[PDB]
Symmetry: D2
């Protein structure tokens, strides 16, 4: 069976929840007959995100990495095609660290594209009535960092064989607390986001 | 009256038929869902209106003549809106380049000749928004409901309320696209906001359950 | 004495900004010669109490046919012609006097709203034909800008002066976006030169709108 | 005079009568800079011919820096592109009517290149001169990205050009003024300000390489 590592991130930036973590916790209680599902919550940390992830790859054989992250302001399931070799944000991570114009892997390639059939994923989700679309920038923060890490490791070691990053809307509860014009941000219920990630897992063979 | 503060509120909940190429309308679906009016403090009426400049208010007026209504809670689709959009203002104007479902186009037409330029709801609209947010539902107050059929019905009810006393109150609630309506969109429109039917229904349910605190 | 008497107003900077496009346009056009109208100019404070006081004193002392009020609408991308003024003060943000108003009428038992009687769609069409992005808006907010607009349309209804009022919301100047951090660095703007031309075009064509 | 600079724009496309990139290049094609030898070139909006025309110019001329301009309708500021990806992909035809879906630009070329120009310093200079400007990490998958990827790939394998940077541009106000429906509210930037932005980049080029 396919070995799948499904990851999410802890809350950050003053949020009390992270949709990626809530989805991972919900799906950790789910049995899929065609895959062996590993789950892992990563820290929002430039240093520790990839240390934790590398330690998991070292101790477990993973065929496919499915990384989830929060993309506040996005309105649909945001499938990321591109990971770039750069850390860059004015905002600190959860360790208080700030990175500006820093490579992830010195003399690594400038970027990787996923080898997953990402448009087929978007099409499957839309046919199941879930808003979904392909994005070409996953940012330059921890989410992109973990994505680039997995695609680079996949390129150099062959493990994981594939990696895909799925950015997620705010949960409605995260927007309900927002002040000013941010009270009008998009959201998607946890039930629908969970269904979307479940559909990806149930149909994984069609995408690799 | 002689009833003092003990009468059951009669509530008219309306939605609209699909329009603009959509096969569904979230307002119509919520009204159908809430059709099973298990509410302890209200007598719930429901009505689906046509998206038609002429017939929308005729059908609505026909219902107002044949039933007694205390509060009109009008629901409508606001494609592109991300949260429960509580409308505070109805204006005396029909104006859109888009035809209604009968093929009529209205441009800069008064709704009620020599009616006021606009009405604001007298419902405690900020308290509705605050209740929904506290229940973890995105919601906000809007000051334009457009100049299409939704605004028209809103103005009609607030004007009829001012001159006749019936209904006593009116509120219009604009609603996001359902996720299935965005899932079919082309190009950049695939990125529009949506809200599940379950959450939209919960929002309208909460307004109905807490109506006393808003009027 | 007999040309069209026009009052053009703008507002002082507010909200941490050091400039306001409305003020800059009024300053530029106060220096211009308009041969076919009598142009009055006035910079108003961003103050719930003092904005309409200063405005009222000008109306008391000068006969004004049309009031053309300008204001900043940070985030808007074109010339934003306001059709509706509503009888409400409501914002979490203080004015420049530190005063906050939530859910209060402007005029006790005034109408809920006024629409301009200016031919506002014709204004939008003229600007577009002159290659200037412009559109009609149905909410001018509930802050000082809307307050002044409602004040003028109410005064016009109750006293007859001014005969007309129109409110024009304006994009940020590019220098106001150039200072912004985070995602606000991507906000729309319009140069002072183009904003000034738009307002000049409205003033030059006023006969066609009233 | 020292740096050989190729400034490019694109022809109108998608139903427009103008392209801001083309107008800027025409306006600047007479401009003399004491530190630069300025080449100008208008490229077709064509998957096939854009890089053919560009390759022919590189083959016959010694270019140090390519500064590519393009239209990004809907963008509000000077949009400095950091990333070119190895992909042609759009629902929309080019001006020759061809459609490309998930086609590599360079077979087994790298998935993407980032510019080696000091792009954050370019953004900071523009902002200090009171011009809205920001760094973008996707230039699309149409002709603009195609030309960008071509130049960065050519730079990596041949050394010519030494550097390339792509600058996406807002609509001109005249392009939004013709728009119907909700598109009448799109952002724009006058030709005068866009031209000043590109002029400032050229004037300060040594700061960025």
């Amino acid at each position: 069976k396919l070995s799948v590592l499904l990851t999410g991130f802890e809350p950050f930036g003053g949020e009390k929840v992270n949709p990626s973590m809530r989805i991972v916790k919900r799906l950790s209680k789910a049995v899929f007959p065609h895959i062996s599902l590993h789950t892992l919550i990563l820290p929002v940390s430039y240093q520790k995100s990839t240390e934790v992830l590398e330690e998991y790859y070292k101790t477990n054989n993973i065929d496919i990495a499915l990384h989830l992250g929060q993309a506040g302001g996005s309105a649909g399931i945001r499938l990321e095609r591109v990971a770039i070799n750069l850390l860059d944000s004015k905002h600190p991570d959860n360790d208080g660290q700030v990175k500006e114009d820093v490579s992830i892997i010195d003399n690594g390639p400038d970027a990787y594209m996923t080898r997953v059939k990402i448009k087929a994923v978007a099409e499957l989700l839309k046919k199941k009535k879930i808003p979904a679309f392909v994005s070409y920038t996953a940012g330059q923060y921890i989410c992109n960092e973990v994505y680039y890490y997995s695609l680079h490791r996949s390129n150099v070691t062959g493990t994981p064989k594939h990696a895909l990053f799925v950015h997620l809307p705010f949960l409605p509860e995260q927007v309900a607390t927002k002040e000013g014009k941010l009270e009008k941000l998009p959201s998607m219920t946890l039930e629908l986001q969970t269904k979307a990630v479940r559909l990806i897992l149930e149909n994984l063979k069609e995408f690799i």
